[PDB]
Amino acid sequence: MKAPSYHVVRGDIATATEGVIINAANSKGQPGGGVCGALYKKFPESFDLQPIEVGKARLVKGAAKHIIHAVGPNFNKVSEVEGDKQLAEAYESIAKIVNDNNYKSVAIPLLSTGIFSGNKDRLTQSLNHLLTALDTTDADVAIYCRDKKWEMTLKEAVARRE
Numbered sequence: 001m002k003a004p005s006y007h008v009v010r011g012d013i014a015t016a017t018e019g020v021i022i023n024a025a026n027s028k029g030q031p032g033g034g035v036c037g038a039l040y041k042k043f044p045e046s047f048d049l050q051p052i053e054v055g056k057a058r059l060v061k062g063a064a065k066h067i068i069h070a071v072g073p074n075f076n077k078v079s080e081v082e083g084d085k086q087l088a089e090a091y092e093s094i095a096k097i098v099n100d101n102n103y104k105s106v107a108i109p110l111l112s113t114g115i116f117s118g119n120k121d122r123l124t125q126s127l128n129h130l131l132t133a134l135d136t137t138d139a140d141v142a143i144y145c146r147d148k149k150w151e152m153t154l155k156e157a158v159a160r161r162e
């Protein structure tokens with residue numbers, strides 16, 4: 001059995017100390033803010049600049065960072081049923097890369113819970129797809145968030161498991 005471990009981190013994912021970082025990208029590969037996003041400013045070298053399909057992911061092995069760019073659904077644009085399918089897909093595409101490269105630890109935010117949320121709280125929905133996919137890996141998973149209320153909810157959800 002593959003067995004992940006999970007813990008929650010409130011802060012900036014650029015500062016993460018895991019083996020690889022996940023960029024929750026748009027289909028242009030950009031983080032939030034475009035070129036103004038912290039990850040881009042810090043590691044432009046780990047950003048190739050090519051299109052990524054929705055629900056797909058692409059690893060870039062930057063010297064200063066290894067970054068998995070993964071495209072969740074934009075709920076402003078896609079139906080609830082289609083977006084759920086794509087969200088599960090996006091996390092699955094991340095887990096696959098984690099396995100094929102045998103990453104030991106990974107830093108991951110909650111896909112589609114910001115600009116792609118459609119102004120709804122998707123914490124639980126996004127977390128649940130994250131756990132299902134990362135349960136197929138052996139990685140130690142740092143789950144990243146910005147908001148202090150979200151942090152407490154993430155810890156609860158994480159402790160309820162098993």
